[PDB]
Amino acid sequence: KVFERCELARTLKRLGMDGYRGISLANWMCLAKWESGYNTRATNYNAGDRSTDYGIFQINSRYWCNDGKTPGAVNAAHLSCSALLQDNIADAVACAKRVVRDPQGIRAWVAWRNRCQNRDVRQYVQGCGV
Ligand SMILES: *SC[C@H](NC(C)=O)C(=O)O
DSSP: OBHHHHHHHHHHHOOOOOOOBBBBBBHHHHHHHHHHSSBBTTTEEEETEEEETTOOOTTEEETTTTTSSSSSSOOTTSSGGGGGSSOOOHHHHHHHHTTTTTTTTTSSSHHHHHHHTOOOGGGGTTTSSO
């Protein structure tokens, strides 16, 4: 599903992302925008390393979700990448939380560094009531 900007912002607040490990909702929004255009169906195959990025946050199959086809990856005891292609983003949020629990935080996503860090990201949440 393709989320409307404010619909997404309110959803992320409800799932407790505002200020999670010091990350503002505006930062999480900036991240979803440049990663998938707020599209839960988004999939990006990295030919170079044979991994795939899945969902609204473009989570990778080598480190975080199991898809079976990715070489040198986390096993089948971990969350299925399919769970990140659902309309309901609860699993994706729970996984995004885990990713930033690493010392690297939100910097784990290179798109965040390019397009969001050291920027006025107020625009992503202005007028949403969050
Ligand atoms: S981010 C999803 C999570 N992955 C790892 C590697 O802990 C899981 O729930 O398995």
